[PDB]
Design a protein around this motif. Structure first.
Motif, PDB file in Angstrom:
ATOM      1  N   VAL A 103      78.269  67.714   8.432  1.00  0.00           N
ATOM      2  CA  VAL A 103      78.016  68.285   7.117  1.00  0.00           C
ATOM      3  C   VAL A 103      76.567  68.052   6.715  1.00  0.00           C
ATOM      4  CG1 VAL A 103      78.722  68.249   4.709  1.00  0.00           C
ATOM      5  CG2 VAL A 103      80.429  67.899   6.498  1.00  0.00           C
ATOM      6  N   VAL A 104      76.116  66.822   6.902  1.00  0.00           N
ATOM      7  CA  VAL A 104      74.778  66.426   6.514  1.00  0.00           C
ATOM      8  C   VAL A 104      73.745  67.178   7.343  1.00  0.00           C
ATOM      9  CG1 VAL A 104      73.249  64.418   6.293  1.00  0.00           C
ATOM     10  CG2 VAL A 104      75.641  64.234   5.695  1.00  0.00           C
ATOM     11  N   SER A 105      74.021  67.350   8.634  1.00  0.00           N
ATOM     12  CA  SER A 105      73.111  68.099   9.485  1.00  0.00           C
ATOM     13  C   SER A 105      73.019  69.537   8.991  1.00  0.00           C
ATOM     14  CB  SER A 105      73.567  68.045  10.937  1.00  0.00           C
ATOM     15  OG  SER A 105      72.678  68.773  11.789  1.00  0.00           O
ATOM     16  N   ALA A 106      74.155  70.129   8.641  1.00  0.00           N
ATOM     17  CA  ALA A 106      74.141  71.503   8.136  1.00  0.00           C
ATOM     18  C   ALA A 106      73.318  71.642   6.850  1.00  0.00           C
ATOM     19  CB  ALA A 106      75.555  72.007   7.906  1.00  0.00           C
ATOM     20  N   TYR A 107      73.389  70.653   5.971  1.00  0.00           N
ATOM     21  CA  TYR A 107      72.576  70.685   4.760  1.00  0.00           C
ATOM     22  C   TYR A 107      71.078  70.632   5.087  1.00  0.00           C
ATOM     23  CZ  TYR A 107      70.420  69.707   0.364  1.00  0.00           C
ATOM     24  OH  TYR A 107      69.566  69.763  -0.696  1.00  0.00           O
ATOM     25  N   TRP A 108      70.648  69.612   5.817  1.00  0.00           N
ATOM     26  CA  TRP A 108      69.218  69.376   5.980  1.00  0.00           C
ATOM     27  C   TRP A 108      68.591  70.403   6.914  1.00  0.00           C
ATOM     28  CZ3 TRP A 108      66.789  67.145   2.435  1.00  0.00           C
ATOM     29  CH2 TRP A 108      67.399  66.143   1.678  1.00  0.00           C
ATOM     30  N   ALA A 109      69.407  71.093   7.709  1.00  0.00           N
ATOM     31  CA  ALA A 109      68.893  72.195   8.515  1.00  0.00           C
ATOM     32  C   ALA A 109      68.324  73.309   7.646  1.00  0.00           C
ATOM     33  CB  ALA A 109      69.992  72.749   9.417  1.00  0.00           C
ATOM     34  N   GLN A 110      68.710  73.352   6.373  1.00  0.00           N
ATOM     35  CA  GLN A 110      68.222  74.404   5.472  1.00  0.00           C
ATOM     36  C   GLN A 110      66.949  74.007   4.729  1.00  0.00           C
ATOM     37  OE1 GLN A 110      69.526  77.509   5.525  1.00  0.00           O
ATOM     38  NE2 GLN A 110      70.658  76.582   7.239  1.00  0.00           N
ATOM     39  N   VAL A 111      66.393  72.857   5.096  1.00  0.00           N
ATOM     40  CA  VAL A 111      65.186  72.349   4.458  1.00  0.00           C
ATOM     41  C   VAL A 111      64.116  72.253   5.517  1.00  0.00           C
ATOM     42  CG1 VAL A 111      64.153  70.486   3.105  1.00  0.00           C
ATOM     43  CG2 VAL A 111      66.577  71.099   2.809  1.00  0.00           C
ATOM     44  N   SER A 112      63.104  73.112   5.422  1.00  0.00           N
ATOM     45  CA  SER A 112      62.091  73.150   6.467  1.00  0.00           C
ATOM     46  C   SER A 112      61.351  71.817   6.543  1.00  0.00           C
ATOM     47  CB  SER A 112      61.111  74.299   6.235  1.00  0.00           C
ATOM     48  OG  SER A 112      60.248  74.418   7.346  1.00  0.00           O
ATOM     49  N   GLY A 113      61.262  71.268   7.748  1.00  0.00           N
ATOM     50  CA  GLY A 113      60.609  69.992   7.959  1.00  0.00           C
ATOM     51  C   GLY A 113      61.476  68.748   7.790  1.00  0.00           C
ATOM     52  N   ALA A 114      62.712  68.900   7.328  1.00  0.00           N
ATOM     53  CA  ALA A 114      63.585  67.737   7.183  1.00  0.00           C
ATOM     54  C   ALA A 114      64.009  67.193   8.538  1.00  0.00           C
ATOM     55  CB  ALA A 114      64.823  68.093   6.343  1.00  0.00           C
ATOM     56  N   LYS A 115      64.151  65.879   8.615  1.00  0.00           N
ATOM     57  CA  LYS A 115      64.559  65.233   9.857  1.00  0.00           C
ATOM     58  C   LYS A 115      65.233  63.904   9.569  1.00  0.00           C
ATOM     59  N   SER A 116      66.082  63.457  10.483  1.00  0.00           N
ATOM     60  CA  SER A 116      66.630  62.115  10.355  1.00  0.00           C
ATOM     61  C   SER A 116      65.643  61.150  10.984  1.00  0.00           C
ATOM     62  CB  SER A 116      68.001  62.000  11.014  1.00  0.00           C
ATOM     63  OG  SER A 116      68.525  60.697  10.825  1.00  0.00           O
ATOM     64  N   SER A 117      65.233  60.166  10.196  1.00  0.00           N
ATOM     65  CA  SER A 117      64.311  59.150  10.640  1.00  0.00           C
ATOM     66  C   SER A 117      65.026  57.826  10.853  1.00  0.00           C
ATOM     67  CB  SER A 117      63.201  58.960   9.623  1.00  0.00           C
ATOM     68  OG  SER A 117      62.449  57.802   9.938  1.00  0.00           O
ATOM     69  N   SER A 118      65.028  57.332  12.089  1.00  0.00           N
ATOM     70  CA  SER A 118      65.642  56.038  12.376  1.00  0.00           C
ATOM     71  C   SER A 118      64.879  54.908  11.683  1.00  0.00           C
ATOM     72  CB  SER A 118      65.703  55.786  13.883  1.00  0.00           C
ATOM     73  OG  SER A 118      64.443  55.998  14.494  1.00  0.00           O
ATOM     74  N   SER A 119      63.556  55.019  11.612  1.00  0.00           N
ATOM     75  CA  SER A 119      62.765  53.944  11.038  1.00  0.00           C
ATOM     76  C   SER A 119      62.959  53.863   9.530  1.00  0.00           C
ATOM     77  CB  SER A 119      61.282  54.117  11.367  1.00  0.00           C
ATOM     78  OG  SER A 119      60.765  55.298  10.793  1.00  0.00           O
ATOM     79  N   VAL A 120      63.034  55.006   8.864  1.00  0.00           N
ATOM     80  CA  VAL A 120      63.248  54.998   7.424  1.00  0.00           C
ATOM     81  C   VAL A 120      64.712  54.686   7.114  1.00  0.00           C
ATOM     82  CG1 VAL A 120      63.168  56.369   5.319  1.00  0.00           C
ATOM     83  CG2 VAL A 120      61.318  56.522   6.986  1.00  0.00           C
ATOM     84  N   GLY A 121      65.621  55.157   7.964  1.00  0.00           N
ATOM     85  CA  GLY A 121      67.035  54.894   7.785  1.00  0.00           C
ATOM     86  C   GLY A 121      67.832  56.042   7.197  1.00  0.00           C
ATOM     87  N   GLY A 122      67.377  57.271   7.421  1.00  0.00           N
ATOM     88  CA  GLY A 122      68.141  58.437   7.020  1.00  0.00           C
ATOM     89  C   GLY A 122      67.298  59.687   7.053  1.00  0.00           C
TER      90      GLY A 122
END
Length: 330
Positions: A231-250
């Motif tokens: 679900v979360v992947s589907a959301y952030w896929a609609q935001v250009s440049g969004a990514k999951s960052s391991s270092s930041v924690g989300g």
């Protein structure tokens, strides 16, 4: 009886909400974090290790003529964010927005973890989950709501959290002027001690609604919305440049982005979270990378409808013999 109290964001990001609570005689007013995900009423106190108190208002039971030490009782809790606290227990008079409980267990902190010390705005927690989660030992204690329930006009409380603005907790009645349309009620499981329910699905922005069961908890004490990774992947896929960052924690996203809304299902009804609600600002001061308000629940073990979701709705916590949850748009 009824009670009504204003709840106020602690900061500009709505990281949490504080509600004034009167404890003792004469009243000592503390600003507590009303938490439908836990079941202890605990406070900073005159007994808290001095080095662990930094700006909070404390409860001093020796100055309350109605405080009584609950002999032999201790408490200790650890929260899903890694924070903790522990101490002893008094019973005292507690009032919220005009609603009074005598003999309420007030858990006085002897120790708190650093994250509590560092947050000067929160004087303690008032738990509103089911009393089966209360940590007092050797005799479990009841929540404020549990103690008040029988006296209330109706055995309910409601959460009406604001976006960048004050809101309201009501006890004992439903303010029919506080929402639009109707309240849709949905089943609750109390098996884990939470207000646990099943959402009927989601949409991202103007996208089509995906019908799918999402079990989770309505948790006013959690800031963000934690949902399955798909679900979360589907959301952030609609935001250009969004990514999951391991270092930041989300998930992080460019602060220049316009975020799409997120819709979740309550039965056939739909609650729309505006995109702005999902922006939690720069990851560090001055950064142009922003932290997302929708994050994966993978590794939490449960989905959490936290403030990001709840503040988009008027939410009824119905504590009838068979509890239910109600959601309305507002």
């Amino acid at each position: 009886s009824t009670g009504s109290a204003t709840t106020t964001p602690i900061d500009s990001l709505d990281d949490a909400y504080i509600t004034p609570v009167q404890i003792g005689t004469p009243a000592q007013t503390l600003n507590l974090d009303f938490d439908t995900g836990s079941s202890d009423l605990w406070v900073f106190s005159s007994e808290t290790t001095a080095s662990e108190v930094d700006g909070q208002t404390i409860y001093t039971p020796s100055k309350s003529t109605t405080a009584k030490l609950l002999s032999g009782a201790t408490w200790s809790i650890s929260y899903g964010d890694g924070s903790s606290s522990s101490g002893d227990v008094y019973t005292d008079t507690v009032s919220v927005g005009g609603l009074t409980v005598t003999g309420q267990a007030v858990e006085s902190a002897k120790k708190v973890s650093s994250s509590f010390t560092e947050d000067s705005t929160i004087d303690g927690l008032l738990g509103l989950a089911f009393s089966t989660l209360n940590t007092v030992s050797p005799t479990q204690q009841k929540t404020f709501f549990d103690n008040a329930k029988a006296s209330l006009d109706s055995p309910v409380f409601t959460a009406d959290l604001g976006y960048h603005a004050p809101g309201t907790y009501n006890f004992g009645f439903i303010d029919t002027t506080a929402y639009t349309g109707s309240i849709t009620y949905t089943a609750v499981s109390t098996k884990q001690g939470f207000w646990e329910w099943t959402s009927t699905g989601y949409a991202v922005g103007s996208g089509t609604f995906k019908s799918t069961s999402i079990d989770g908890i309505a948790d006013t004490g959690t800031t963000l919305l934690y949902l399955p990774a798909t679900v979360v992947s589907a959301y952030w896929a609609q935001v250009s440049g969004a990514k999951s960052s391991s270092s930041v924690g989300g998930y992080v996203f460019p602060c220049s982005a316009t975020l799409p809304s997120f819709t979740f299902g309550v039965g056939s009804a739909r609650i729309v979270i505006p995109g702005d609600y999902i922006d939690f600002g720069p990851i560090s001061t001055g950064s142009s990378s922003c932290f997302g308000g929708i994050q994966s629940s993978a590794g939490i073990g449960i989905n959490i409808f936290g403030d990001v979701a709840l503040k988009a709705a008027f939410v009824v916590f119905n504590g009838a013999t068979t509890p239910t949850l109600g959601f309305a748009s507002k």
